[PDB]
Each structure stands twice: as C-alpha cells, then as structure tokens.
C-alpha cells in the first residue's frame, strides 16, 4: 500500500485541479472555447482543451498516468500562447502565471509517480 502507491497521483491531480478552478487566472480556461461563438478559433487551434475537459477525463478514468494529464494541461497553455501571443495581453499574462503555478505543483506528482514505477519494476 501507501509507499510507492501507483494510484496516489489520481487524488493529487484532483486536488490540484481544485486549486486551479479557484484561481482567478484559470477563468478564461475553465470551459471549452465557444466554438460556435468564436469562429476562427479552429482556424488557429488544432486540439482545443480546457480544465473542465481535463477534470472529466480524469474522473472517467481516461488518463493512464499523470504524464497524460500533464500533456493535456500543457496543451491548454500552448493553445493560449498560440491564440494570444502578445506579452502585453492580460490573457497572455494570466496563462503564464497559471502555467508556472501548475508546473510547480505537478512537479512532485510526476517525480513521485515515476519513482514508484521504478521501484515496482525493480522488485
Ligand atoms: C481560452 C482563450 O483562448 N481565450 C479566453 C481567449 C478569448 C477571449 Cl479573451 C475572448 C474571446 C474568445 C477567446 Cl478564445
Ligand atoms: Mg486514452
């Protein structure tokens, strides 16, 4: 059980999403972009992603690892940077701030999970 528990990431990711949903900085990123309201978004962005879609994919069991979750979250940020590339835009700055908060908190989740995989493979 608890040392090197390979399923502990899931709850840790739930908690981290909870903190993201509280952040004012996530507000633009909580819901899918209204694709029928914002017409050229698909002209620019190949794979839209947002935090509600991530939270559901996790709840539904459709992430195999926290690295798969982290890939989707990074896509949220790389999509913002592509759609709102100006350092002057307040949306750009929100995305930047929230991305750095995310990468700080996910860091231990990934390392712990990889350390666990290692242990179990070894033994
Ligand atoms: C997630 C994202 O790309 N946002 C919120 C930028 C944005 C704004 Cl500020 C206003 C209208 C449409 C869009 Cl699409
Ligand atoms: Mg899959």
Swiss-Prot record:
Residue intervals of the Bromo domain: 4-109
Positions of modified residues (Phosphothreonine): 47
Taxonomic source organism: Homo sapiens (Human)
Disease annotated for this entry: Chung-Jansen syndrome: An autosomal dominant disorder characterized by developmental delay, intellectual disability, autistic features, anxiety, hypotonia, obesity, and dysmorphic features.
Cellular location(s): Nucleus
Physiological role: Probable regulator of the insulin and insulin-like growth factor signaling pathways. Stimulates cell proliferation through regulation of cyclin transcription and has an anti-apoptotic activity through AKT1 phosphorylation and activation. Plays a role in the regulation of cell morphology and cytoskeletal organization.
Parent-record interval covered: 1315 to 1435 of 1821
Phosphoserine PTM sites in chain numbering: 3, 93
Tissue: Expressed in myeloma and epidermoid carcinoma cell lines.
Assembly information from the UniProt record: Interacts with IRS1 and IRS2. Interacts (via bromo domain) with acetylated lysine residues on histone H1.4, histone H3 and H4 (in vitro).
Name of the featured protein: PH-interacting protein
């Amino acid at each position: 059980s608890m040392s090197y528990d390979i399923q502990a990431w899931k709850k840790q990711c739930e908690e981290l999403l909870n903190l993201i949903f509280q952040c004012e900085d996530s507000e633009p990123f909580r819901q899918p972009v209204d694709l029928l309201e914002y017409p050229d978004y698909r002209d620019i962005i190949d794979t839209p992603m947002d935090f509600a879609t991530v939270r559901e994919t996790l709840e539904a069991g459709n992430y195999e690892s926290p690295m798969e979750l982290c890939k989707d979250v990074r896509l949220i940020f790389s999509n913002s940077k592509a759609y709102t590339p100006s350092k002057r835009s307040r949306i750009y700055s929100m995305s930047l701030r929230l991305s750095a908060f995310f990468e700080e908190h996910i860091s231990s989740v990934l390392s712990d999970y990889k350390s666990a995989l290692r242990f179990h493979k070894r033994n």
